[PDB]
Structures are given as structure tokens and as C-alpha cells.
């Protein structure tokens, strides 16, 4: 079945709880597999220890730059970047999980979790999952963001992995 994965998130070293995500491998298998493997670390690199570097309330929480920690970096399990798989899934509401990019065919490791319907991103960012449990933890993360995206506490993925 579709992978079920988790992110355990801290703020300034204090646990906020766990976000559980379903990865829709039945629709975007290549994109789902990249995220799954970056959660387990099985390729020797991944999300463990990296940050939510940009968090904008009433928009989205962005993470996954485990190379430069500022939105300029990241890499996929396939190479530096990989193509846009498809745009079949849409940004339907809060809790959508989607890939960040710098234009067409620039997916790496950066991703975002929506806190509102971001339908204006449809057809430009590859959606690949959604929050199963822990939207309250996502709201905690959101509360440490700002309109510029700068966070008022250091938000870290303390641990991550796969549940099924
Ligand atoms: C919706 C969150 N998000 N997803 N992808 C992005 N990328 C950017 O904003 C930029 C990339 C390069 C210069 S700006 N943001």
C-alpha cells in the first residue's frame, strides 16, 4: 500500500510532536519514493536533523534543504534534481504535501505542508501526499513563522522514518 511516514519535530530542542503523512505512490511513485527514502535515510542522507527554514502563516511550512539549511539546496535520491512526474493531485486544502521547486523540472528534496488551500500552485508543484495525523503539530510549527517566512524558533526534524 501507499507508504505511511512520520516527522518528529522540535522547536529550540523541545518536542512538538509527530506529523504522519500518506505518500500517494499509486499516483506519483517516483516522487513518493524519493520522500520515503529521505525519511528513512537509507541512501545515507535525508531529512533527519534538518529544519523548517521558511514558515508563512496562512500559507505553508517549508523544509527539506538538508545541505544549505536556507532554501537554496537539497538533493534527490536520483541525483541533484528530477523531472515533474505529473500534476494529477491538486492543492485542495490544508494538509497537502507538495514539492518545492525553482521552476519546471527542478525537484530535489525540499517540500512544503499547506496550511490553507493553495490552488494557485496547481500545475506548477507536484503534490504527492497529505497529513494523516498531527495537523495540530503542523499548526504549532505555523505559529513560529511570520509573513516573511523567518521562524522565531529553530524548527528541526529531530527524527523521521516509515510506519508501514
Ligand atoms: C510554495 C513554497 N515553495 N515551493 N517552491 C518554492 N520555491 C521558491 O519560492 C523559490 C525558488 C527559487 C527562488 S524562489 N517555494
UniProtKB/Swiss-Prot annotation:
Inhibited by cyclosporin A (CsA). Is displaced by CsA from the mPTP leading to a lower open probability of the mPTP. The modification N6-succinyllysine is found at residues 24, 43, 132, 147. The modification S-nitrosocysteine is found at residue 160. It catalyses: [protein]-peptidylproline (omega=180) = [protein]-peptidylproline (omega=0). GO terms for molecular function: cyclosporin A binding; peptidyl-prolyl cis-trans isomerase activity. The modification N6-acetyllysine is found at residues 24, 124. It comes from the Eukaryota. Its main location: mitochondrion. GO terms for biological process: apoptotic mitochondrial changes; cellular response to arsenic-containing substance; cellular response to calcium ion; cellular response to hydrogen peroxide; mitochondrial depolarization; mitochondrial outer membrane permeabilization involved in programmed cell death; necroptotic process; negative regulation of apoptotic process. It is found in: Mitochondrion matrix. One of its GO terms (cellular component) is mitochondrion. Residues 6-162 form the PPIase cyclophilin-type domain. Keywords: Acetylation, Apoptosis, Isomerase, Mitochondrion, Necrosis, Rotamase, S-nitrosylation, Transit peptide. Its EC number is 5.2.1.8. Belongs to the cyclophilin-type PPIase family. PPIase that catalyzes the cis-trans isomerization of proline imidic peptide bonds in oligopeptides and may therefore assist protein folding. Involved in regulation of the mitochondrial permeability transition pore (mPTP). It is proposed that its association with the mPTP is masking a binding site for inhibiting inorganic phosphate (Pi) and promotes the open probability of the mPTP leading to apoptosis or necrosis; the requirement of the PPIase activity for this function is debated. In cooperation with mitochondrial p53/TP53 is involved in activating oxidative stress-induced necrosis. Associates with the mitochondrial membrane ATP synthase F(1)F(0) ATP synthase; the association is increased by inorganic phosphate (Pi) and decreased by cyclosporin A (CsA). Interacts with ATP5F1B; ATP5PD and ATP5PO. Interacts with SLC25A3; the interaction is impaired by CsA. Interacts with BCL2; the interaction is impaired by CsA. Interacts with TP53; the association implicates preferentially tetrameric TP53, is induced by oxidative stress and is impaired by CsA. Interacts with C1QBP. Interacts with MCUR1. This is Peptidyl-prolyl cis-trans isomerase F, mitochondrial. It comes from Homo sapiens (Human). The lineage of its organism: Eukaryota, Metazoa, Chordata, Craniata, Vertebrata. The gene is PPIF. The chain holds residues 44 to 207 of 207 of the full protein.
Amino acid at each position: 500500500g501507499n507508504p505511511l511516514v512520520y516527522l518528529d519535530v522540535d522547536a529550540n530542542g523541545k518536542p512538538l510532536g509527530r506529523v504522519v503523512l500518506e505518500l500517494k505512490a499509486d499516483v506519483v511513485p517516483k516522487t513518493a519514493e524519493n520522500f520515503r527514502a529521505l525519511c528513512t535515510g537509507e541512501k545515507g542522507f535525508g531529512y533527519k536533523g534538518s529544519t523548517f527554514h521558511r514558515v508563512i502563516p496562512s500559507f505553508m511550512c517549508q523544509a527539506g534543504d538538508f545541505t544549505n539549511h536556507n532554501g537554496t539546496g537539497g538533493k534527490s535520491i536520483y541525483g541533484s534534481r528530477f523531472p515533474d512526474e505529473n500534476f494529477t493531485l491538486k492543492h485542495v486544502g490544508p494538509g497537502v504535501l507538495s514539492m518545492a521547486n525553482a521552476g519546471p523540472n527542478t525537484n530535489g528534496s525540499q517540500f512544503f505542508i499547506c496550511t490553507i488551500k493553495t490552488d494557485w500552485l496547481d500545475g506548477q508543484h507536484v503534490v504527492f501526499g497529505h497529513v494523516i495525523e498531527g495537523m495540530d503539530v503542523v499548526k504549532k510549527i505555523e505559529s513560529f513563522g511570520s509573513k516573511s517566512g523567518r521562524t522565531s524558533k529553530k524548527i528541526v526534524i529531530t527524527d523521521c522514518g516509515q510506519l508501514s
